[PDB]
Design a protein around this ligand. Structure first.
Ligand SMILES: Nc1nc2c(CN3C[C@H](CO)[C@@H](O)C3)c[nH]c2c(=O)[nH]1
Ligand SMILES: Nc1nc2c(CN3C[C@H](CO)[C@@H](O)C3)c[nH]c2c(=O)[nH]1
Ligand SMILES: Nc1nc2c(CN3C[C@H](CO)[C@@H](O)C3)c[nH]c2c(=O)[nH]1
Ligand SMILES: Nc1nc2c(CN3C[C@H](CO)[C@@H](O)C3)c[nH]c2c(=O)[nH]1
Ligand SMILES: Nc1nc2c(CN3C[C@H](CO)[C@@H](O)C3)c[nH]c2c(=O)[nH]1
Ligand SMILES: Nc1nc2c(CN3C[C@H](CO)[C@@H](O)C3)c[nH]c2c(=O)[nH]1
Lengths: 230, 230, 230, 230, 230, 230
C-alpha cells in the first residue's frame, strides 16, 4: 500500500500538495514553514509534511521532466490529492518584459511533452484551475509582490540541437510568457483526474530574495486552499 | 477602410465585443439593451452597437463554424477589439450533471478545428482570459443564476458519421463539460492578437427563461469590462 | 421533420441543389430564374426553390467556411439531394494566367479543412463528379464563355499570420488553380453520401458581367442535371 | 542522356505513354498493336514503341508499388511525356457490385503511399485528368464494353498484418470502388509535372476475354489522345 | 501453393535468402556460385537456388522500392525464410568520408516508406539482426575488404522536387551513412515475422572490382549462416 | 565550466560512463568497484568516479523519464563521453518467456518519448552501438549468466489510463522484448552526438542475485570498453 515511487501511503497524502522539481528545494521550503515532518526520500522524489498558518500540506519533489513528474502526479492524484500547485523555475520568452528574477503565475501551458498525448488527444488544452490561479495572484497581491501572468511552454527539450528548429521563438511570437518542463503535464493529468492545479514560476534565464517571495506566495496559497478541505 | 466581411469601419469597433453565432440572436439581444444602433448586415455577419448600463459595446454575429467565425474574430482583433466574449449554445458532455437549459462559463477549449492549427502548433492551449471568466462568474453570482464551469469541445463536425469514430466520448471521459463549434478558435486568435476572450454557453441538447438569464450575464459582463476602456 | 439548420422539410429538397456562400447571392440568383418560391431563412442558410428552363431546383446559402457549410451539405445529402453544385468566388493561385473576373470549373480540391478529416482519412481525395464537371463545361461552351479548369485549395484560413507559413505558395507550385473555403468539404461529403458534386468559381482577388455569365452557366447546368431526375 | 532506369533517350519518349506493372504485360500488349519496336529492358522497366491505328506511343512497365513506379513516372514526365494512362489490375472494394473480371475506369485515388507525400502535402488530391477519363469511357462505349467508374485505394501494403488494422473496409464504406498500388502516385506526379493521367483497371480478386477488352480500350484511348500531339 | 509473386513453392524456400533489387544482379551472382538452379522469373522477381561453399540458399530479386519489395519479403518470411540479407547499391550521405565504390554494412535504417508504417507504429525501430551484421563484418575482415558501418536512409523518393524539402541533409547531419530504398522495410518486416535480417551496400553516387568484393562478402555470409540450419 | 545539472567539470568526464535511473543504485554500484570517488550530487543526478579492473569510468544517475535523462546524456555527450551504457530495470513484454529477474541486453528501442522527436524525425531509428552490445553479451557469457536480447519499448507513460489505449500490446505482438523509459532517448542522442551506446536491463514486473549479476556484466563491459581510450 506504499506508493511505488513516492514511498508514502495514501494516508499521508493531504488534500493540498506543493510540488517542486529539485528535492533540494523541498528542504529549503520545509524550514520556512512553522514545522515539518520528513516522510520519505526515494529516487528523485522527496516528500515532507509541511505545517503552515494552521494548515497541513505535503511538499514533494517531482524531478526534471514530464515523464518523471507524471509518475509523481499520478501517484498523488490517484491517492487523494485535490489540489496540486507547482512552484518551479523557468526561462523568459519575452526578454524585454519578463526579466531574470521575475515571477510568473501561469494559467495554461503548451503540451510539448509525450505523456499528456499518451493520455488524451493533442487538441485538449493544458489549463490550470481558475481558483488556484486566483488564490496565487491574491497572495502575491497581499504580500505586495509584482507578478506576471501568462502561458508556459512546457518542453521536453532542454538542450536544442541544430537539425529540427526549436518552436520556442514561434511560441514567443504567439505570446507565451515563459518556458519550463512540467506544468502542461501537471495540468492535463489534473484535469483528467479531477484535481485542481496551478503553477508559479521564477525566471532564472532565457535573485534569492525573489525566490523567498515566490515561496511565501506558494506556501500562502497552499494554506488558503487547505482550509477548504480541513 | 470598411472591414471586408463585417462591413463596418475601425472607428465603429468598441473595446468590448459580444459575439454570437446566429444573426437572429443579435436582434434578440439588442432589444434587451437600453438602446442600440444597427451598423451593418453582410453575409452571416450582423453588427449592432449596444448601449447598456452607461457603456457602449458591439454585438456581432459570427456564423456557424470555426473557419467562418475566424474571419469575424480576425477583423475585430486586428481593428481595435480588446475583449471578445462569445455567448452561444452547446450540447452537454456530462448528461447526468449538466442538463438542458443549464449555463456553462468556459475557461478553455479543445481545438478540434483546422484554422487554429494553421495559425499555431497544436500543442498550444485554447484558453480564455481569467479576468473575463471571473467577470462572467461574478455577474452570474450577483444575478443569483446557477452556472457550471468547464472546458468546451469546439468541434468542426456537427453531424458525425460511422467510419471515423467521434472523439466526444473520449473528451467526456476527460471531463470536458460541453461541446460547440467556435470557442477554441476565438481563444487561440485572441491569445495570438493580445485580445482577452471568454465564453458563456447555454445547453440545448447532448428554456427561454435561462436564455434570458444567460443574456443578462453576458451583457452585464460586457458593461463591466467596457468601463476599463471608457 | 424540418431540417435543423435549413428549416425546410425533406419534401422541399429537390434532386439538384445549387449552393452559394452568401445568402445575398441566393436573392440575386432567384430573380434570374423564370420564377421562384422563398422557402426559409435561418441563420446564414437561405433556401429558395428556383424554376428555370422547365425544371425545379433549390438554391441554398451555406455560409463562410467548412464547418458551417458541412451542416448545410449533410442536411441536403441525408434528405434526398442527388446533385449539389457550388457556385462561389475564389482567389487566383496563378496570377499571370488566371485573372480577376475569370471563371474556373473545378474537378478536385485540397482538403485544408478539419471536418472532412473527422469523416474520412486524409489520404482520401476531394474529387468532384465527372458528369457534373462535364455539364458545367458544356454549358460554358454553348454560352461562349471562356473558362479555366483546375484544382481549388479549400482552406479554413482566410487571414494568414506570420508564425506558421501558409501553404498557398506550395499549392501554386503544385499547379492548384484557385483558392476558396468550401469545395473540398462538399466533395468529400458528396462522395461519402453518394451525391454528385461540382464547383464553378469566379476570381475576385489573389466584373459583374462575368458574375452574370457564371450564374447563367450554373443555372444552365442545374436545369440540365435536373432533367435526369424529373 | 539515357534515362537512368528506363534506359531510353528523351527522343524515344512519345507524347502518350501506356504504363503497366508487369513487364510481361508489355509483351502481351505489343503483339495486339499493328506493329512495335522493342526499345529497352532494364530491371523491371520494359519499354516498347507501339504502333496502333496510325499513331505512335510507348508502352512501359513500372513494377509493383509506388516508390518503384514513381521512378518510371518521373523519368517519363521530366522528358516529354504529356499523357500517361495506367492499365492495371485491382481488387474489388464493393464485392456485391464489382466482380472478378469487371473493368473500372478511375478518376481519383487514395494516397496510401509515401512518395506522393514526400512531394506534396497530404491534403492535395490524387485526381486524374478529365479528358483522359472521358476518352477511356468513350472507347469502352464504342466497343460496347460495360465499365464501372470510381475511386481507387492505392495502398503500399499488399499483405496486411494483424497489429495495425487495414483501412480498406473504411474506404469501402467511403465508396471507394477498387484497390491497387500505383494510381495515386501517377496522378499526383502528373499534376505536379503538368502531365495528364488516367487509369483503367481489371478486377482479379478482393477472365482473359475481359483483359483483351480492357487492353483494346486502353490502346484505343492512347491512339485517340496521340492524335492531339502528332 | 505457389507464392503469388515469386512463383516458387514453400518447399523451394531455403533458411537463408540473399535479396537484391535488380533481377539482372541475380544472374551476375548465380555464376559466381559453385552451381545454381534457375527456379522462377515473374514480374521483377527472379528466384535462383545458389550452391556455395557446401551450402544451399536462394538469391531473389525484389525490385525497386519499398511497396514492391515488401511483397517479396512477406512471401519469403511467411513461407520459411529464417535469414534475409539485402545486397544493394546506395548513395553516400557522408561524401568526404564514404566514396563511390565503398561498401557499407548497415545495422539500422530510417523508415522513410509507407508500408512499414501500415504494419507497425512509426516509433518502432528499423534494426537489423546483430549476428547477421557480425557475420557480414567478419567475412569482409577475412577477405581483407575495408567496409564502413552505419545507418541507411531508406527513402521512397528517388527524385526529389522543389516544394517539400528532402530530409536527406537532416539525416546526414544526424550521422546516417548512406541512402537507398528498401532496407528499412526488410528490417521491420523481419522483426515482425521473426526473421533475421541484414544489409550490405555499395556506393555508386550521392568500381566493378568493389562489386565483386561485396558479392563475395554477401555469399560468404549466406553460406556461414546457412550452416546453422542445415 | 561545471555542467549545469551534473555539477561536474568536463575534466571529470571519462570516455566510458555507466548510467542508471536511481541515484541510490549509483551508491550500490560504487561499493562493488575496487575503489571510487564521490564527485557530485545535484537534483536526481549523482556522479561517482568508479575504479574497476584497472580502469576508470563514471557512474551517473539520470532520473526517471526521457526529458530528465536527456539533460544528463546531452551534458555527458557534449563534454567528452565516448561510450554510455544504461543499466536499468524493465517490465517484460513476453511474460511466457522473459520472467521476473531475467536480464535483457538491448540493441534498439521504440521511441515513445518526445525529446528524441524534437531532435530528429520519427523515422530515424533508436539503435545501440554493435560493439557495446557485443561487449555486454560477451561479459555475460564469460560470467555464465543467461541473458535475453531484444528491442525495448521506451515509453513516457508509466501509468496508463483508459481513454487512449496503450501501445504495449501492439509492441509485444511486434516482438519487442521489454519496456522501460529512457533507452530510446539515450540511443538517439548518442547517434546524433557520435557517442556509442548500449543497454542492459533486469526485469522486475510486466531477485537481488540477478541484480548482482547484471551489475557485474555492466561493470565488466565498462572496463573492457575503457581500455580502448586509456
Ligand atoms: N525548458 C526549459 N526549462 C527551464 C527551467 C525550469 N526547470 C528547471 C529544470 C531544468 O533545469 C526543469 O525541471 C525545468 C529553467 N530554465 C529553463 C530552460 O532554459 N528551458
Ligand atoms: N458541435 C456541436 N455544437 C453544438 C451547439 C452550439 N452551436 C450551435 C451551432 C450549430 O447548431 C454552432 O454555431 C454551435 C449546439 N448543439 C451542438 C452539438 O450537438 N454539437
Ligand atoms: N481562402 C480564400 N477564399 C477566398 C474567396 C472565396 N469565398 C469568399 C468567402 C470569404 O470571403 C468564402 O466563403 C470563400 C475569395 N477570396 C478568397 C481568399 O483570398 N482566400
Ligand atoms: N493493394 C492491392 N493491389 C492489388 C492488385 C493490383 N496490382 C497487382 C500488383 C500486385 O500483385 C500491383 O502492381 C497492384 C491486384 N490485387 C490487389 C490487392 O489485393 N491489393
Ligand atoms: N534513395 C536512393 N537510393 C539509391 C540507390 C540504391 N538502389 C538503387 C535503386 C534505384 O536506382 C533502388 O532499388 C535503391 C542508389 N542510388 C540512390 C539514390 O540516389 N537515392
Ligand atoms: N515504462 C515502464 N518502465 C518500467 C521500468 C524501468 N524503469 C524504472 C523507472 C520507473 O519505475 C524508470 O526509470 C524506468 C520498470 N517497470 C516498468 C514499467 O512497468 N513500465
Amino acid at each position: 500500500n506504499l506508493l511505488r515511487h513516492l514511498k508514502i501511503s495514501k494516508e499521508q497524502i493531504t488534500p493540498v500538495v506543493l510540488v517542486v522539481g529539485d528535492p533540494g528545494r523541498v528542504d529549503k521550503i520545509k524550514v520556512v514553514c512553522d514545522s515539518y515532518v520528513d516522510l520519505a526520500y526515494n529516487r528523485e522524489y522527496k516528500s515532507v509534511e509541511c505545517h503552515y498558518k494552521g494548515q497541513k500540506f505535503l511538499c514533494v519533489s517531482h524531478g526534471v521532466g514530464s515523464a518523471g513528474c507524471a509518475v509523481c502526479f499520478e501517484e498523488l492524484c490517484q491517492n487523494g490529492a485535490k489540489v496540486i500547485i507547482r512552484a518551479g523555475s523557468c526561462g523568459s520568452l519575452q526578454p524585454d518584459l519578463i526579466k531574470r528574477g521575475d515571477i510568473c503565475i501561469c494559467n495554461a501551458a503548451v503540451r510539448e511533452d509525450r505523456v499528456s498525448h499518451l493520455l488524451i488527444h493533442g487538441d485538449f488544452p493544458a489549463v490550470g484551475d481558475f481558483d488556484v490561479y486566483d488564490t496565487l495572484n491574491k497572495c502575491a497581491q497581499e504580500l505586495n509582490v509584482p507578478v506576471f501572468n501568462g502561458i508556459s511552454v512546457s518542453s521536453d527539450m532542454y538542450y536544442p540541437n541544430k537539425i529540427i528548429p526549436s518552436r520556442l521563438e514561434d511560441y514567443s511570437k504567439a505570446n507565451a510568457a515563459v518556458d519550463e518542463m512540467e506544468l502542461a503535464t501537471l495540468m492535463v493529468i489534473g484535469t483528467l483526474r479531477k484535481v485542481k492545479t496551478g503553477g508559479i514560476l521564477i525566471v532564472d534565464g532565457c535573485v534569492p530574495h525573489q525566490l523567498e517571495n515566490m515561496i511565501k506566495i506558494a506556501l500562502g496559497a497552499c494554506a488558503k486552499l487547505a482550509t477548504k478541505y480541513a
